[PDB]
Amino acid sequence: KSKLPKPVQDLIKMIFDVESMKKAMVEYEIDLQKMPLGKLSKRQIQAAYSILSEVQQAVSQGSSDSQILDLSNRFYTLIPHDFGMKKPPLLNNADSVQAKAEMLDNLLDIEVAYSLLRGGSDDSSKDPIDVNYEKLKTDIKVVDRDSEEAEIIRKYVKNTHATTHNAYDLEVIDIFKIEREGECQRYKPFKQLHNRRLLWHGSRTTNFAGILSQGLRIAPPEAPVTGYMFGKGIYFADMVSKSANYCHTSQGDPIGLILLGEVALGNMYELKHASHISKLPKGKHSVKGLGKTTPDPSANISLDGVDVPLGTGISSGVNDTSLLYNEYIVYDIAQVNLKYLLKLKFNFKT
């Protein structure tokens, strides 16, 4: 039996759960009889992204529903959806492209998790929890509840839950300190950059095996840049509830995972509205989507030289913006250094 702390063992069990991967695919309307977990591949996912880009091109060029039908059908041929003997819904607009791009991002992480489970060795004498932990190539430790870092993290959670996200509240179950192998070395050129912030990144539990083993990634070249508000980058928030919404937890599945990453923001390119970019203008290191609300700048504190915007939400003074809250985007994977992973219990009031 494993000598790992019980919370670390529970975390490993959660992220490598095959039935959870299947459930996530069902939620996305994928036909598991036609496309089981074992049949997913990088090649097929990449081909589906490319077709989504074909659809995006027809969408921008104002193509008719009859003109788009073949392109829409090509997507379904590659990624079978649960529709029986019926005609599937038409992928004829920007919202459809965005939704399918999000689904493919998830499939890409699920394929990584499944490939780790299938591509190793079998030894019944070892605890499968230890075996699966080693596949993550990440040092995972439990943060002591009475420590300074635990106090700062709990305050960040307590203070940045938006009033507009009040259908639920959050309870921190466990706080883990994480160290992905080689990430500290990769981060070296950015470790002393100005404007380094400790920010939230929420994702479905089924993505975490992929995130821990490969780090946060940018959508592939084949992915449509218009499927993402600020293009193909890595997205973060300074409001815990804004990232917690991306966990996609429910009354029937109320436990979620959220990351705290040190993000080297540097010179921010400030935007109020969608800008589908792949590269930043010269001199810029990140995009800041300007929210109507921001954590109070006077309440910013420092945790190991990194700024933690844990103030309660106040008016930013930014007018006529598409964003209720701030968002931060980097376009180089080396600008992120993952620091903590929190296991959260979502208490739904609805």
Author numbering: 662 to 1011
List sentences from the manuscript.
In accordance with multiple reports of crystal soaking with inhibitors for the generation of small molecule complex structures, we found that the CAT domain crystallises readily in the absence of any ligands. Upon solving the apo structure, we observed weakly defined electron density in the nicotinamide pocket, which was attributed to a molecule of DMSO from the cryoprotection process during crystal freezing. Differences within the ART subdomain between the DNA-bound and apo- structures are much smaller than those in the HD, but there is a very localised difference involving residues Pro885 - Tyr889 that come close to helix D of the HD subdomain. Mapping of these data for the WT apo-protein onto the crystal structure shows that the regions of highest local mobility correspond to surface loops, but notably such loops are not uniformly mobile. In the HD subdomain, the residues that show the clearest indication of local flexibility are Asp678 (between helices A and B), Gly723–Ser725 (between helices D and E), Phe744–Lys748 (which form part of the linker between helices E and F) and Gly779–Asp788 (which form the linker to the ART subdomain).
Upon sensing DNA damage, particularly single-strand breaks (SSBs) that are the commonest form of lesion, it becomes strongly activated, catalysing addition of poly(ADP-ribose) (PAR) to nearby proteins, including itself, and thereby signalling for assembly of downstream DNA repair factors. A key component in transmission of the allosteric signal is the HD subdomain of CAT, which alone bridges between the assembled DNA-binding domains and the active site in the ART subdomain of CAT. Here we present a study of isolated CAT domain from human PARP-1, using NMR-based dynamics experiments to analyse WT apo-protein as well as a set of inhibitor complexes (with veliparib, olaparib, talazoparib and EB-47) and point mutants (L713F, L765A and L765F), together with new crystal structures of the free CAT domain and inhibitor complexes.
